[model samples]
Target: AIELVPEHQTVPVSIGVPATLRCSMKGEAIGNYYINWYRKTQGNTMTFIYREKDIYGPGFKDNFQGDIDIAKNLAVLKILAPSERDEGSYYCACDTLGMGGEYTDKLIFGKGTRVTVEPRSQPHTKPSVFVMKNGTNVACLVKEFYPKDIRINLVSSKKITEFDPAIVISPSGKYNAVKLGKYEDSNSVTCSVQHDNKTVHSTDFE
Candidate 1:
């Protein structure tokens, strides 16, 4: 029986920033063993990313843009400028082909990890937070629609009108923003999205 250890994990990063996904495995294996990576979007469709063996299917050479160090047994997948599209669940699997091409063997998974890239900003705010039931908080961040693209800036305080290091924007246009704070304080924040130097989306609450 194949066991997938570390069932779940999560990696966080800022949009347009570099991110790396690492997977390690341990088990008895033959010399011609194969390692692979697979990505599944929110909709549950599996897309092949990388694989050491296998002549068919989407392999690392097609989508992966990083280095794979065989000696350390680490598959390092690097994303130069990560976007919302790169946010999803991924898995690292290993399998071996029996001698004489008799059969394609089983795959062992290394607890999958979910990668999430948030809007970039200094003094980083928590991406997602839980609020008390029946408690009122600020409205969620709003995203504007634009002909070219939309940029949502997450700020530390809603009072400040200028963009600074305490601001982060989504790489693939604006859609949503998550609050990373735990306290339900009104002075925490206010978020807004802009298009063409005009405020298209804004939200403020306690």
Candidate 2:
């Protein structure tokens, strides 16, 4: 059993560049005990990159993209060709790095390692717009971009703050929508999102 640290806090590099974030624990002698690497996404679940031999977790198994290594109680997650999508927190077992503490216990966590893959990407949108409940709500939907860092705003002619506030975005960037008000018209709504000052999106109206 042992403790670890943040997984290379705020790693900023470029596409196709390799970056390795590592953590240390005190129990390399824990027989047959292995560590797990993960990518914690927003509002959902962690993408588990297991710590055995040659574990593949989709999009990151040997496209020369990334891999992990655990030996002598130190675990390393390597980001090969780190992309915009690969930016975020990397997590490992725990703190208090001394041997004899197995981390299978509940309510405890390894330290966090966040990777911020730099400088922003240019944002572009192929938005899908529609009205729901016959104009009871105007849905502005946006999908698929890079860098994974995003700021989305669905506004009126000015800025729309009136919201249900219960709705949100899906990480990994699939189908996320914004519902603005009970009043609807195609000319009365617009959606704008910035991809860290890169990408391109249009204003005007919904």
Backbone-clash count (model 1): 4
Report the lDDT of model 1 for residue 34: 72
Which lDDT tens digits does candidate 1 get at residues 58-143? 44454356444566456556666666667788787777666666665777777788887665544322232122212223333333
What is the Cα-based lDDT of residue 50 in candidate 1?
69
> Best-fitting candidate, measured by TM-score?
1
TM-scores for every predicted model: 0.52, 0.48
Candidate 2: C-alpha lDDT: 0.52
Query: 1-206, model 2: which lDDT tens digit per residue?
Result: 44555545666665566778776665444234445677775553677764445765765676322233434556667777665567667776432233375743332246677776543234543443333333435555444444444555555554423564222223433334454554344456555655547533444333
* lDDT scores in order: 0.52, 0.52
Q: What are the root-mean-square deviations of the candidates from the true structure over C-alphas?
A: 10.5, 7.3
Candidate 2 ranges beyond 4 A from true positions: 7-17, 26-33, 42-44, 57-59, 63-73, 83-88, 94-109, 116-136, 139-206
Candidate 2's error at 87, in angstroms?
A: 4.5
